[model samples]
Target: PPKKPKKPGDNATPEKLAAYEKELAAYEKELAAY
Candidate 1:
C-alpha cells in the first residue's frame, strides 16, 4: 500500500467511499423508477 504519504483516509480506503457511491446510485435509481 503506497499509503497516500500525506493525507490518511483522504484518497485511500475507497471501499467505504465506493459503498456510499453505490448507495447513492441505488437511491437515484429508486427515485428515477418512481
Candidate 2:
C-alpha cells in the first residue's frame, strides 16, 4: 500500500479539527462496541 498522508491536519482549522475529532471519537466508540 502507498504511504499514508502526512500532516493530515495541515489543512484543518480549530473548528474543522474539533469536528473531525468529535466524529472520529464517536466512530471509535461505535466500532469498539461492535
Candidate 3:
C-alpha cells in the first residue's frame, strides 16, 4: 500500500488535523487487515 498520509502541521486548523488523523487511522486499519 502507498505511504500513509502526512501529519498536519502544528499551525493546521482543527478540521485539517482531524481529517489527517482519521485518514491515518483508516490506513493503519486496512494495513493491519492484510
Candidate 4:
C-alpha cells in the first residue's frame, strides 16, 4: 500500500507545494516504520 503522489512542479503555487510536502512527509514517515 505504498503509493506516492506526483510532486509539484517548479511553477506550483505555495499552497500546492506546502500541501504536497506535507503529504510527502507523511508518506516518508510510513516508510520509516518499515
Candidate 5:
C-alpha cells in the first residue's frame, strides 16, 4: 500500500474516490456497449 499514491479525488475520501472510479468505469463501458 505504498507504491506511488496517485490518487485523483482531492475533495473526496479514498472510499468515495474508489466508488467514483468504479461508477465512471461502468458508465464508460455502458456508453461503449450502446
Candidate 6:
C-alpha cells in the first residue's frame, strides 16, 4: 500500500490547524473504538 498524506496542515493557519486537529482527533478516537 502507498503512504497516505501526513502533512494535512501543510499550509494551514492557526485556526485551520486547530480545526483540522479537532476533527482528526475526534475521528481518530472513533476509529480506535472500533
Taking all chains together, the TM-score of candidate 6 against the true structure is 0.54
Please give the lDDT score at residue 22 for candidate 1: 69
For model 1, the superposed segments whose C-alpha errors exceed 4 Å read 1-12
lDDT of 5 at 11: 80
**Deviation in Å, model 2, residue 18 alpha carbon:** 0.4
**By the lDDT metric, which is better: model 2 or model 4?**
4
Alpha-carbon TM-score of each model against the true structure: 0.54, 0.59, 0.68, 0.69, 0.63, 0.54
Model 5 CA deviation exceeding 4 Å by range: 1-10
**Candidate 5: RMSD to truth:** 9.6
C-alpha local distance difference test of each model: 0.58, 0.62, 0.83, 0.83, 0.65, 0.63
RMSD of each: 11.9, 5.9, 1.5, 1.5, 9.6, 4.7
Number of clashes found in candidate 6:
0
> For model 6, how does the per-residue alpha-carbon lDDT over 3-31 read when each residue is reduced to its tens digit?
22245546768877777677777667767
lDDT of 4 by residue, 1-34 (tens): 5559688788899999888898888889877865
lDDT tens digits, residue span 1-34, model 1: 1112232366658776776676666766777776
Error of 1 at 9 (Å): 9.8
Give the C-alpha lDDT of model 3.
0.83
Ranking 5 against 6 by TM-score, winner: 5
Location of the lowest summed lDDT over 10 successive residues in candidate 3: 1-10
What is the number of backbone collisions in each predicted candidate, taken in the order shown?
Answer: 0, 0, 0, 0, 0, 0
Runs in model 3 with CA error above 4 Å?
none
